Design a protein around this nucleic acid. Structure first.
Ligand SMILES: [Mg+2]
Lengths: 127, 206, 151, 114, 79, 98, 101
RNA sequence: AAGAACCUUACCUGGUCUUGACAUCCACGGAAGUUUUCAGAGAUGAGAAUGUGCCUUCGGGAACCGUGAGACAGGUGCUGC
RNA sequence: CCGGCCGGGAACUCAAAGGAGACUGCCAGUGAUAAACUGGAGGAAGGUGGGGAUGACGUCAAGUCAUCAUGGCCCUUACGACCAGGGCUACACACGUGCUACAAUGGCGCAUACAAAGAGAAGCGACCUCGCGAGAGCAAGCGGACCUCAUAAAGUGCGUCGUAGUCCGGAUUGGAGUCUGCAACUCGACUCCAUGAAGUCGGAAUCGCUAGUAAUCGUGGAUCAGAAUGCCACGGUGAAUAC
């Protein structure tokens, strides 16, 4: 009837309410065409949605915070994938086989003292 | 000097902080200054009493001081006249009432600080460095422990060049964090110069 | 590396009509993390060439590619004294990646109005096999095929 | 399009051509534009003389090529004859805002010849 | 380049200034106040400005008003 | 009503102090919201472990400030009096506001 | 450690606490946008030098309390990084440990 | 050096002092504290009005201020060989 | 008054605590039936899961007697101390590390969206007024999951520049303005008027990096009365190759 997906990626976190019905995207009270629908990474949130019909299967009331555009995009993707629980392992057996359920943290490494971006040194020079 | 401080690295896991109290940023500095003052003055006064350490707290804007030592009799004096003099001369500088309380340890040779202080007393008593080192290690290990390691730096022997020497007995994993290790370093000033003695005693394994 | 026998990373198919070779192409063009403008120019020049040649986009890109795709490559392996070159084949992965890199270089240079324009022009001259990436390939075949006595 | 200074722009937008006058920049040019009712996108090949006249009589308000040149000349000569730190630097060929001269300030000092 | 609200001077300095004003031209007045400005009345003085070790006698000028004394009292010597 | 905000450094001490104080407060001053964790604030410091060159050589220390809202809901007589004169468990700083 | 400079700073601090924060009126009040822009404020900013260079909060270098080290000083602990780390590794600063994350 | 306008400053000049700017002593004299004028670059000196208790051993005390010698203070002065 | 603004819930993220799990866990093969290696199930993560702190015996008779204490030496009416000003920012000139760039993925102007972690009371500093802008004034809240830094920028819609040492770029310089501070000459920052240079990818040689890394963008903190292109810390899009 109405299920929840958490979603998070690169310091970001979302909240998705999935419901059978129409197929519009309320993304932070905006539409996907507006939020990042003119910029790249547009079907990122749609990547987990073509293996199973979505145009007229269920709508999603979405909100996100943290991270950047693509960060919140990955957050919404993970949220979709967690919300996909009334569509359980019957579909995950393939969704996972193709990913979309792996957190893929690859968290940013803190800046280490003496470096410039945690890996960049100050232009060494012998003499 | 490339090694970390065992006590400092173990504070956040095993060992307890020396000064335990709370303060907002506005008075944290003056609080630490008062703590340093009371500490250095009490050390100046009772360095004879062979104090291992002192814990400092401040219950409700009133200062409290536990003295982990081994000669409570000397610390207090008969009837506690020393206790009273210290309380007064410390509350004068602290601005608050001071609850100073002694506490004995019946194994003084297991305290890094006490052992360093004894080695320093012998260093000014002209005792041989090798003999002092060996005797302290023996005292500790025979009284009971899972390992010890002593080191001395300076002009041991009063020679011309600086040579530092160490000696260990038993198991002493420093990179181990669960290792309750007693560590402290003293100083000794003789006609030849400065002498720094340090000790690490692997007291417990958890 | 010395010991590690790891493979290569796993890139994602492009949002636009499915592909991975041109996805890696756009990832190469991407500088300072400016993926949006890189993809914009990619698609612009892609559709430009598609409409100029009447074909479809990925197939026109494959046409412009196969022409710049080289045959061999020269590498140095000194053996007991004098150092020398040696012509040898190259993997298909690095082959197509180097072809795409030559394309990107010839596009970056020779700037008329915009990068979409440069990239479409290079795509065209490579499709008809008269560009600068194809001349880079010809220079590679010149380097090779001459010192082929080393083997 | 013979405005004060030299001002010989052809097919150039208003302010971008007017800044050519030594004595006017983008800001003062936009001010002149909004005063004389001139736009900041139309070029010289399209502007009319009935408005070039307003350009002339409006830029006549602030200092111009020659006036500003001679004003700066008399000011720096005043500094030089004053002989303050500013004039001493002006005469020794070093900057006056007090940046680095040990290494930098080669623009004002002179080419890195030796 | 600062202190919009009028100039700033020293008591001793202004006192000697007005004394010389009411007495006429006088010998160089030793002033260690390089952090002070000059007024329209001091034009004609021969005040000696401090540089750090020595005094530079300078004949004041009406144009030398908004400036300071360290301006015309060189401090660093080069060759 | 009574917004009760306590703060300490050591979680293993603030936890027990909060437990015992919430007990002594709700056992007679019930209708509490509980020990709202009030997430921790970390004051970090970077210092130069060396007194001289090797500026690159440094160290990083920090101090954790943990807090616990209690938020008692009723100004009870078993509360306004039996909360004061009970500021034990030193090392913690408490502030109650009606 | 230049006990003379220590007494210098102590003077500065005490004389400032005495004069300023109490007599800001001369330079921080009379120097206001109002009718006082006449000779009133001129005489105010003139009497400004009634105090010496001292008495100001700007001359407060905030040197270390233990060693007077001006550099490597932290306004929080009131001491320089040297003694800060010393007391920390000794365990005298409450709640201080090694920051690793 | 996680920060030079004064200061920071360990350097330079000039003006100053001396058991001294910094901690302590005896003895002597003044209670401090507070406001204010004069010269000076100011340090300082020349000053002018105000000011008295916490104990009675109560020939004075406890701080505070100034004068004389001395012990000493004081140094970012040397060697990190 | 559609601001979770509020009644109303502890659903959810988040939250601080207490735990589970991820340890070659098991299977197939290889391996001297051992160690162990490779692939696979489930699982978010598989073999030290990611990163960090943690620096063996000791070498370089390495750097600090200038942070401090100190062996000896040495000034000790002085190599001691105070104060005005100056210096450390000086400049024929050689070198090292960073920012700007040297442009069309764009300079450019207008309209639009998305960070985490922090700091803040003789400080942070609503609203409102002016101020091109420094920012000035009046004057709430906040010593804090409330009040302020604080609007995040790259990204995107429209278009000038449509290729020129050019609208790229901002240094040099004078008048005038704001601010920190006793005061801005030496010697501050900031905003406007005028200005636009070299510089068009960089010679030999040389540095960093195998992942969220680099590249690039932005934000916060310490130093501070005021004063970063630096340091530290956090987040933003997001690679490449590895025979
Ligand atoms: Mg030898």
């Amino acid at each position: 009837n109405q299920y929840y997906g958490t979603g998070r990626r690169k310091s970001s976190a979302a909240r998705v309410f999935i419901k059978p019905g129409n197929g519009k995207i309320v993304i932070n009270q905006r539409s996907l065409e507006q939020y990042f629908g003119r910029e790249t990474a547009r079907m990122v949130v749609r990547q987990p949605l073509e293996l199973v019909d979505m145009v007229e299967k269920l709508d999603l009331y979405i909100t996100v915070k943290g991270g950047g555009i693509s960060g919140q995009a990955g957050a919404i993707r993970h949220g979709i994938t967690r919300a996909l629980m009334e569509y359980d392992e019957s579909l995950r057996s393939e969704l996972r086989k193709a990913g979309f359920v792996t957190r893929d943290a690859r968290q940013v490494e803190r800046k280490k003292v003496g470096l410039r971006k945690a890996r960049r040194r100050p232009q060494f020079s012998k003499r | 000097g490339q090694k970390v401080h065992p006590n400092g690295i173990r504070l956040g896991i095993v060992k307890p902080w020396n000064s335990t109290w709370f303060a907002n940023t506005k008075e944290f500095a003056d609080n630490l200054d008062s703590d340093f003052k009371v500490r250095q003055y009490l050390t100046k006064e009772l360095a004879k009493a062979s104090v291992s350490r002192i814990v400092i707290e401040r219950p409700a804007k009133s200062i409290r001081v536990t003295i982990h030592t081994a000669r409570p009799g000397i610390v207090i004096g008969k009837k506690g006249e020393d206790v009273e003099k210290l309380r007064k001369v410390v509350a004068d500088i602290a601005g608050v009432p001071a609850q100073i309380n002694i506490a004995e340890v019946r194994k003084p040779e297991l305290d890094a600080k006490l052992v360093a202080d004894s080695i320093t007393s012998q260093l000014e008593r002209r005792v041989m460095f090798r003999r002092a080192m060996k005797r302290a290690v023996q005292n500790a290990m025979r009284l009971g422990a899972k390992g010890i390691k002593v080191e001395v730096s300076g002009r041991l022997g009063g020679a011309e060049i600086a040579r530092t020497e160490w000696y260990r007995e038993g198991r002493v994993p420093l990179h181990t964090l669960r290792a309750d290790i007693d560590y402290n370093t003293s100083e000794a000033h003789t006609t030849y110069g400065v002498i720094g003695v340090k000790v690490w005693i692997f007291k417990g394994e958890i | 590396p010395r010991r590690r026998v790891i493979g290569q990373r796993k890139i994602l198919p492009d949002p636009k009509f499915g592909s991975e070779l041109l996805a890696k192409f756009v990832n190469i063009l991407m500088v300072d993390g400016k993926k949006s403008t890189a993809e914009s120019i990619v698609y612009s020049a892609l559709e430009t060439l598609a409409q100029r040649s009447g074909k479809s986009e990925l197939e026109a890109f494959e046409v412009a590619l196969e022409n710049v795709r080289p045959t061999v490559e020269v590498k140095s392996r000194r053996v007991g004294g004098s150092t020398y070159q040696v012509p040898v084949e190259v993997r298909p992965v690095r082959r197509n990646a180097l072809a795409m890199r030559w394309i990107v270089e010839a596009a970056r240079k020779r700037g008329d109005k915009s990068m979409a324009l440069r990239l479409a022009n290079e795509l065209s001259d490579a499709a008809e096999n008269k560009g600068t990436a194809v001349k880079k390939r010809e220079d590679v075949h010149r380097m090779a095929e001459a010192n082929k006595a080393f083997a | 399009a013979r405005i004060a200074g030299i001002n010989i722009p052809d097919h150039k937008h208003a302010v971008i051509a007017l800044t050519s006058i030594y004595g006017v920049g983008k800001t003062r040019s936009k001010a002149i534009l909004a005063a004389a009712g001139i736009a900041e996108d139309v070029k010289i090949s399209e502007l009319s003389e009935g408005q070039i006249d307003t350009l002339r009589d409006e830029v006549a308000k602030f200092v111009v090529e020659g006036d500003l040149r001679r004003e700066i000349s008399m000011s720096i000569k005043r500094l030089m004859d004053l002989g303050c730190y500013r004039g001493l630097r002006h005469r020794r060929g070093l900057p006056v805002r007090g940046q680095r001269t040990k290494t930098n300030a080669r623009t004002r000092k002179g080419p890195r010849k030796p | 380049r600062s202190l919009k609200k009028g100039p700033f001077i020293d008591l001793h300095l202004l006192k000697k200034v007005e004394k010389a004003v009411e007495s006429g031209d006088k010998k160089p007045l030793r002033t260690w106040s390089r952090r002070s400005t000059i007024f329209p009345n001091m034009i004609g003085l021969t005040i000696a400005v401090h540089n750090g070790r020595q005094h530079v006698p300078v004949f004041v000028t009406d144009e030398m008003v908004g400036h300071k004394l360290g301006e015309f009292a060189p401090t660093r010597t080069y060759r | 009503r009574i917004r009760i905000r306590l703060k300490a450094f050591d979680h293993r001490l603030i936890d027990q102090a909060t437990a015992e104080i919430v007990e002594t407060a709700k056992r007679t001053g019930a209708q509490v919201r509980g020990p709202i964790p009030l997430p921790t604030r970390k004051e970090r410091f970077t210092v130069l472990i060396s007194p001289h060159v090797n500026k690159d050589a440094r160290d990083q220390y920090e101090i954790r400030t943990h807090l616990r809202l209690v938020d008692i809901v009723e100004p009870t007589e078993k509360t306004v009096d039996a909360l004061m004169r009970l500021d034990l468990a030193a090392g913690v700083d408490v502030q109650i506001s009606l | 450690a230049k006990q003379s400079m220590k007494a210098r700073e102590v003077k500065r601090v005490a004389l400032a606490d005495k004069y300023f924060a109490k007599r800001a009126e001369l330079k921080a009040i009379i120097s206001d946008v109002n009718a006082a822009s006449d000779e009133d404020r001129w005489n105010a900013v003139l009497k400004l030098q009634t105090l010496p260079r001292d008495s100001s909060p700007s001359r407060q270098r905030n040197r270390c309390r233990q060693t007077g080290r001006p550099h490597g000083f932290l306004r929080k602990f009131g001491l320089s990084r040297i003694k800060v780390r010393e007391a920390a590794m000794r365990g005298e600063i409450p709640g201080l440990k090694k920051a690793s994350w």
